Structures are given as C-alpha cells and as structure tokens.
Amino acid sequence: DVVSVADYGAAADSGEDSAPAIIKAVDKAKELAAEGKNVTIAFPKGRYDIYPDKAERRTLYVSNTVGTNSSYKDKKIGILLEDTKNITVDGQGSDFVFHGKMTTFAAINSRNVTFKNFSVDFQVPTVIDLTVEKVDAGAKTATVYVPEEYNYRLSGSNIEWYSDSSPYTGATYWTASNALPYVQLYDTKTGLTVRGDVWTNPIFQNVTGITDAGNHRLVFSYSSMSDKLANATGISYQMRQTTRDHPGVFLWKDKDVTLKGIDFRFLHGFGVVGQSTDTITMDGLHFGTGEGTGRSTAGYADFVQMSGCKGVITVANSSFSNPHDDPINVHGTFLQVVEKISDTKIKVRYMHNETAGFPSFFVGDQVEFMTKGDMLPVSDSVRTVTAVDGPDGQGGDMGAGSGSLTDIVLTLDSAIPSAVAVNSHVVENITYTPEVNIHDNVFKETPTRGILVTTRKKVTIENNLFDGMGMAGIYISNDAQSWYESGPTRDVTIRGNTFRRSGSDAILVEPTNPTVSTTDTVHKNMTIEGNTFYVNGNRVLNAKSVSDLTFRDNKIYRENPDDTVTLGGDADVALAVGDTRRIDATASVSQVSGSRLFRLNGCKQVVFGGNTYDVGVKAGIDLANMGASEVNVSDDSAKVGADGLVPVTGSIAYVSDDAAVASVDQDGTITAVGEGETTVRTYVIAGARRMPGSVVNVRVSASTAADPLDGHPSSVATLSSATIDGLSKSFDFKPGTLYYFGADSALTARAAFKATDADASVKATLNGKAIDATGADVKLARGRNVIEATVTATDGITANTYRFVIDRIG
Numbered sequence: 001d002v003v004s005v006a007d008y009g010a011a012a013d014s015g016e017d018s019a020p021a022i023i024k025a026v027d028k029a030k031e032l033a034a035e036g037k038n039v040t041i042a043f044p045k046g047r048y049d050i051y052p053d054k055a056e057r058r059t060l061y062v063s064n065t066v067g068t069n070s071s072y073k074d075k076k077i078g079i080l081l082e083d084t085k086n087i088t089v090d091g092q093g094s095d096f097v098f099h100g101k102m103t104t105f106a107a108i109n110s111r112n113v114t115f116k117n118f119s120v121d122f123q124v125p126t127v128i129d130l131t132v133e134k135v136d137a138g139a140k141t142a143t144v145y146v147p148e149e150y151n152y153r154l155s156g157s158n159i160e161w162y163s164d165s166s167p168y169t170g171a172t173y174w175t176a177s178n179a180l181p182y183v184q185l186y187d188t189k190t191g192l193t194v195r196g197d198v199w200t201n202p203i204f205q206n207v208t209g210i211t212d213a214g215n216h217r218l219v220f221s222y223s224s225m226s227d228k229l230a231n232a233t234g235i236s237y238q239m240r241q242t243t244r245d246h247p248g249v250f251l252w253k254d255k256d257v258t259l260k261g262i263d264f265r266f267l268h269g270f271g272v273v274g275q276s277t278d279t280i281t282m283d284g285l286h287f288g289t290g291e292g293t294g295r296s297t298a299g300y301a302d303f304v305q306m307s308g309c310k311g312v313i314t315v316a317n318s319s320f321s322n323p324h325d326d327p328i329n330v331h332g333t334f335l336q337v338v339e340k341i342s343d344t345k346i347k348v349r350y351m352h353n354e355t356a357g358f359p360s361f362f363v364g365d366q367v368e369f370m371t372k373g374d375m376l377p378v379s380d381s382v383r384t385v386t387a388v389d390g391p392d393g394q395g396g397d398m399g400a401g402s403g404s405l406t407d408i409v410l411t412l413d414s415a416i417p418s419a420v421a422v423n424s425h426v427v428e429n430i431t432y433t434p435e436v437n438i439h440d441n442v443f444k445e446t447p448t449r450g451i452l453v454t455t456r457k458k459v460t461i462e463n464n465l466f467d468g469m470g471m472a473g474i475y476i477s478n479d480a481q482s483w484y485e486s487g488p489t490r491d492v493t494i495r496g497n498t499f500r501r502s503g504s505d506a507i508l509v510e511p512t513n514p515t516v517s518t519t520d521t522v523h524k525n526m527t528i529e530g531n532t533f534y535v536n537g538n539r540v541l542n543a544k545s546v547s548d549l550t551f552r553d554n555k556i557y558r559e560n561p562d563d564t565v566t567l568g569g570d571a572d573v574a575l576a577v578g579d580t581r582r583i584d585a586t587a588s589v590s591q592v593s594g595s596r597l598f599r600l601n602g603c604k605q606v607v608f609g610g611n612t613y614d615v616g617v618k619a620g621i622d623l624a625n626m627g628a629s630e631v632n633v634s635d636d637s638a639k640v641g642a643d644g645l646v647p648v649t650g651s652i653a654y655v656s657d658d659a660a661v662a663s664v665d666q667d668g669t670i671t672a673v674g675e676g677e678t679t680v681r682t683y684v685i686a687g688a689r690r691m692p693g694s695v696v697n698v699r700v701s702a703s704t705a706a707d708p709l710d711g712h713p714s715s716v717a718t719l720s721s722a723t724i725d726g727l728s729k730s731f732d733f734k735p736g737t738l739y740y741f742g743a744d745s746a747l748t749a750r751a752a753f754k755a756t757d758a759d760a761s762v763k764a765t766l767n768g769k770a771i772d773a774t775g776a777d778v779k780l781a782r783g784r785n786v787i788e789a790t791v792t793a794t795d796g797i798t799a800n801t802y803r804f805v806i807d808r809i810g
C-alpha cells in the first residue's frame with residue numbers, strides 16, 4: 001500500500017511548492033489507514049520544496065518554546081500526520097527544503113508512524129553564520145564570509161538581511177538588520193563551540209563602513225579594533241533571534257513514533273519536540289551542517305526535546321553538531337500548587353514563561369507532590385487524577401476550562417496529604433515519565449550541556465562520545481525554583497562513554513533545592529562505570545543529593561601528557577671498548593592542575609571502586625554538607641578530603657640502536673662493546689604511556705681491554721608531516737600545532753599525512769568522509785571544507801586530531 005506524492009502533483013526537483021500535494025497524499029494515506037492498511041507515503045528521490053503559505057496551520061502550545069504568547073500560537077507545519085496510524089513517510093533519500101518560519105513535520109494523536117530517509121534544510125536559514133576570514137588591525141578592517149544561502153543589501157555601515165519570497169504573493173518571509181540579538185562562537189580551527197557575551201557581536205561593534213569584495217566576502221571597516229575581533233580569524237559567528245516561534249518537529253500525543261535516517265541540516269525555531277507521547281525511537285539521525293555549505297548552525301536551539309513523555313525514549317547511532325542549546329533534554333514539568341480548593345481539588349500553575357498552555361494531566365494519570373524547598377516527595381502523596389479543567393493545548397478547554405493558559409484545576413481520587421500547601425509544593429505527572437536509552441551517539445560542537453535527563457524510570461547512557469561540551473557533558477538537575485523541569489531519578493546507568501575536551505564537569509548532578517536534607521536525597525541509584533575521562537583541569541563528577549551513587553571501573557587519563565627524559569650528563573660521549581659511562585637521566589612527567597576530580601554535596605551511600613587514575617591527576621574528593629562516613633573508598637585509590645595526586649614518578653628505560661657498538665643496561669650504564677657510532681635512546685614510562693626522551697650519541701674507538709619496552713607501547717601520537725598541495729598559499733605545518741585555517745579559491749587539493757611513529761594509526765577525513773591518509777586527491781566543495789587527521793598512538797589511549805579548514809572562495 002503505497003501513496004506516491006508524484007500522483008498528487010509533487011514532481012521531484014520541480015522547484016515548485018509541494019505542500020498542497022503532500023496534503024492530498026496524506027489525505028489518501030489516512031483513508032487507506034482507516035481501512036486497516038499499512039501505508040507508505042513515498043517521495044521519488046529528489047529535492048522537494050515545501051512552503052508555509054498553503055501548509056496546514058494549527059494553534060499549538062509547545063513545551064520550552066514561547067509559553068502563552070499569542071503572537072506565536074499558530075504554527076505552519078510542512079508535513080502533518082494527524083489522528084491516524086500505521087503510516088510511514090519514506091523520503092527514499094530525498095532533500096526536503098522548507099521556507100520561511102515553519103515546523104518541518106509533525107504527528108499528532110497518531111500511532112505507529114515513521115519518518116525516514118530524507119534530509120531537512122531551509123532555503124534561507126534563520127540563524128546567520130558569518131565566518132571571519134581575515135582581520136587587519138592596522139587598517140582596522142575584517143573580511144567576513146557570508147555563506148551563499150543568505151540574501152543581503154548594504155546601505156552605508158548597515159547590512160539588511162532578507163529571506164526568500166512567497167511564490168503565491170511575493171511576500172518576503174522575514175528581514176533583519178546588522179547583528180541579530182544572540183550570537184555564539186564556532187571556532188572552525190579547533191572545532192569547539194562556546195557562548196561568550198552572547199548579546200555583543202564583535203563583527204558589528206563600531207562599524208563605519210561595509211564594502212562588497214565579491215565572492216560573498218564583505219570588508220568591514222571599524223572606528224576601533226577590539227581584542228575580541230582581533231582574534232576572530234577562523235571563527236564562525238552564529239547569530240539569531242531567540243524566540244522559539246515554531247518547533248522544528250512536533251510529536252504530540254502519539255504512540256510508537258520512529259524517526260530514522262534523517263539528516264537535519266537546519267531546523268528553524270526549535271528541535272524535535274516530543275510532548276505527551278508514548279515511545280519515540282530516533283535512530284541514525286545526523287544533526288549538523290555538512291559538505292557544500294559555509295553555514296555551521298544546525299539547530300536554532302535544542303536538537304531533541306522530550307517533554308512529559310512516557311514509554312521508552314531511544315536515541316541511537318546519531319550525531320549532534322552545533323545547536324544553540326542542549327542536544328538532548330528529557331524532562332517533565334513541575335506545576336506549582338496555587339490554590340487548594342478542597343482536600344481533593346487543587347489549582348496548579350505553569351511557573352516558567354516558556355512552558356504553558358497545554359495539558360500536563362489527563363484523567364486517569366497518577367501525580368505525586370514534592371516539597372519545593374528540599375525537592376523531596378511528600379510521603380504517601382501519589383494520587384490518581386479524576387478530572388481536569390484547563391487548556392487543551394490547541395486553544396480550547398479540557399473539562400470546564402480554567403480561564404487561563406497557565407492554570408490547570410485537578411480533581412484527585414482521594415484527599416491529598418495535609419502538608420500540601422499553596423506555593424510551597426509542586427505536582428509532577430508520574431505516568432508521563434519515560435525510560436531513556438541513549439547509546440552509540442556522537443556529541444560535539446556544543447556550547448552548553450550534552451545530555452539532560454530527569455526521569456524516575458530506567459536511564460541508560462551508554463557508549464557515547466562527548467567532544468568539546470562547553471558545559472557539563474551530562475547534566476541531571478530536577479528543578480522547582482527557576483526552570484520547573486521535573487523528574488527525580490531512581491535508576492541511572494552511565495557506562496562506556498568517552499569524554500574529551502570537556503569544557504566543565506564531565507558529569508554534573510545538581511537539583512536546585514536550596515535546603516539540603518540529612519534524612520533523604522533527591523536522586524537515588526546512579527551507577528557510573530566503565531567510562532573513559534580525559535581530564536585537563538575540570539572535574540570528572542560533581543554530584544549533589546544522590547544516594548547509592550557508585551563510581552567504579554572508570555579510566556581517567558591526562559588529556560595533554562607532556563613527558564620526557566632530560567640528561568644533564570653530556571649527550572655526547574666517547575668511549576674506549578670495555579669502559580663504561582653512566583647517564584644522569586631524570587624523568588619529567590606533567591600533571592594536571594585545577595579542581596579535584598570529584599565533588600559530593602549532600603550525598604549518601606557513595607561507593608568508589610576499581611577505577612584507574614593516570615599519573616598526575618588529583619584523584620581526590622571534595623565534600624559539602626556531608627561527612628566522610630557516607631563515602632566508601634576502601635576499594636579505590638581516590639582520597640576523601642584531600643587532593644590525592646597520583647605520583648608523577650616516571651621510570652626510565654634505555655635502548656641502544658646498535659648493541660654491537662654500545663650496549664646499555666636499565667640503569668643507564670653504557671658499555672663500549674665494538675668500534676663505531678651509535679645512539680642510545682631514553683624513554684619515560686608514566687602509567688600506561690611511554691614517550692621518548694633525549695638521546696645520547698656514543699662514539700667508541702678500539703682498545704686492548706627492545707625487552708625493557710615490552711608491555712609499554714609507544715604513546716607518540718603526532719604527525720611529522722602534513723602536506724596540502726594545490727592551494728594558492730600553503731599551511732606552515734608544525735607537529736605541535738594541531739589546527740589550521742585558510743580561505744582559498746582552489747577546487748581540488750592533494751593531502752598527505754605521516755605519523756611521527758610509523759606504527760601509529762592515522763585516520764583522515766574530508767568533511768567527515770574517510771580518505772587515504774598517505775595521499776588523497778580531494779575535491780573542495782562549496783563553503784567550508786574540513787580535513788581532519790586523527791593520530792592514535794600504538795598504546796590505544798593517546799591521540800591527537802589535526803584540523804585543516806579551508807573556506808572555498810567562488
């Protein structure tokens with residue numbers, strides 16, 4: 001049972017609006033679904049343009065966006081499955097290009113529906129990503145690359161931005177001028193994204209003029225060159241409005257939704273929102289800009305928001321790059337008790353201004369009450385909802401209504417506990433709490449937190465890579481003070497993940513309760529095991545109010561090891577055959593400053609065991625609002641209430657190139673053996689790593705007179721050469737400099753990389769795709785091309801990722 005959009009007027013690659021034809025095709029699919037058929041809506045492979053003008057329009061109130069604001073209550077939706085079941089939307093590899101401000105696709109009141117096999121983009125994205133390519137502090141100018149997707153007109157020192165236009169009316173969908181309200185910084189050189197001063201864009205401070213240099217480059221002139229702007233070369237400044245007028249995808253009141261094999265190249269307004277939906281599976285989603293664009297923002301805000309859902313939320317085999325908020329947030333909403341009408345009837349209120357106007361309770365749901373101050377449940381407070389009067393989330397009333405989009409009146413099956421009082425207690429819907437399974441994903445290029453999750457059901461975060469999270473890699477809060485986002489946790493497992501280039505704590509557990517309790521804790525039963533943490537000054541774990549917290553069998557490594565062996569005793573020795581000389585070699589092993597790796601704040605029944613700590617890290621524990629009697633380190637080497645620095649005492653090994661000329665024992669005594677010249681090499685072993693140190697050259701004249709590296713594989717993880725030919729100007733490669741940036745008109749290049757240690761593994765990519773690191777002819781696409789070379793030493797632990805970034809000039 002197949003419905004092709006081609007039979008309803010949507011030709012592939014037509015350049016015409018497909019929105020009316022998709023509506024008709026969905027209509028037919030719904031007819032067949034209502035006959036009991038499993039239906040596929042097929043898109044013959046190609047580009048499809050979907051405009052908002054004729055798209056389905058719905059009044060919708062959406063968690064974590066714009067709250068009750070009536071200016072934005074009406075949503076345009078490009079592909080809407082409503083009130084249906086058993087329908088797969090199969091793009092068959094098509095490219096869907098949306099226009100203006102709209103939601104891309106949605107399912108509402110629908111069961112067993114799937115979206116798969118297409119990309120999602122906008123003609124003119126609403127985040128404007130400007131790369132500074134050159135700055136001239138002497139002339140006080142900067143050269144700014146405006147990606148080809150954007151339209152603009154110049155007027156003196158102003159730039160005016162505009163979208164594309166309606167085919168039906170000629171209306172411009174939106175316009176703006178100069179700096180948009182919010183900006184964040186994607187450093188294309190390092191591949192790190194951070195927030196700085198988000199309300200001050202340095203491209204647009206003290207601009208005196210702008211000139212079009214052609215090829216989509218603008219030369220800005222300034223009355224003064226700030227420090228922020230002087231160091232801006234290679235930075236893509238991602239600027240936008242902050243109003244979340246649309247969800248990017250909306251999955252409201254569904255059951256068994258699957259999204260899979262979708263490339264989200266840009267989402268306007270917000271990310272994928274699940275709301276009051278039972279079971280959503282997300283598999284093989286790639287949020288990120290890719291080859292062929294100079295843009296860098298993929299998400300106007302969050303990528304995945306699961307608000308008040310239930311069943312199982314799965315995110316698997318997916319990748320996340322350059323949102324303007326958290327990649328993943330699974331949570332519910334606390335509503336505050338604002339009126340006790342009777343012992344079985346209360347009014348509750350949406351307290352945060354971006355979440356309001358939709359139902360968080362249906363008849364039959366179970367609720368539980370919480371004391372705001374200590375964020376602990378009221379004992380014996382689970383009740384079943386028997387009646388709901390409040391907003392239905394599409395502008396109408398559930399029950400009698402409440403007279404307000406922020407207020408819901410609940411009737412409960414039995415008298416609530418006497419302790420529950422207005423404004424001191426909140427209510428959580430405990431039916432709409434999901435199990436969470438996030439595994440085999442890649443998170444990078446993110447200015448905020450990687451994963452937020454607050455649910456009482458089973459949570460598994462397993463086998464993910466975190467690189468460059470600007471804030472905590474994993475953040476588990478529970479908040480009835482500012483964000484009003486619910487979910488005390490009861491069963492969390494964080495296992496097999498790798499954290500790299502962490503901008504803050506790798507893992508942060510911090511409910512926002514002001515009052516720290518000695519009887520109970522907010523969260524319980526959290527197990528953090530088998531992860532690898534590369535550390536460089538920030539904590540591994542910062543946990544507040546968790547009981548039965550276990551941290552075991554993890555591996556902690558220095559992210560930037562700097563080891564050597566110095567000599568002092570002359571590096572040049574001449575010997576007579578039979579005589580001996582001793583090397584005065586002393587090992588040098590770098591250590592990581594900053595915080596103790598662990599902090600615990602009001603926790604109970606904490607156990608550390610079986611963890612591996614690299615030399616030179618502060619494997620120690622800070623305690624707050626708790627005693628050491630709640631922390632068990634009997635089976636671990638972490639120290640309570642002390643730094644617990646792992647000693648930086650390296651051992652020294654000695655290997656001669658040619659022992660027929662000169663031999664050496666493991667004390668550093670050279671023995672002249674034969675005539676000739678040879679070099680004896682030192683190596684510093686420090687924990688699981690082995691680095692070379694200074695060498696000694698031995699010259700031995702006539703007279704009448706390796707196995708210490710076994711179990712110590714090499715940790716050399718540098719390149720010795722990196723050549724990129726075919727460019728107007730060449731990079732000045734240095735083994736110690738990882739990151740390079742340039743802009744060039746070249747259409748092709750030849751790249752070759754060589755490891756310092758020929759045994760080390762080199763993995764090279766162009767725009768994420770593997771290339772032959774020994775030598776590859778590469779095509780440079782439109783926009784920003786990124787050649788990455790990752791060298792992994794033979795120890796399997798030490799790696800460096802080099803980046804060569806070229807903006808194409810065309």
Ligand code: NA
Nearest residue numbers: 052053076100
């Ligand atoms: Na419109």
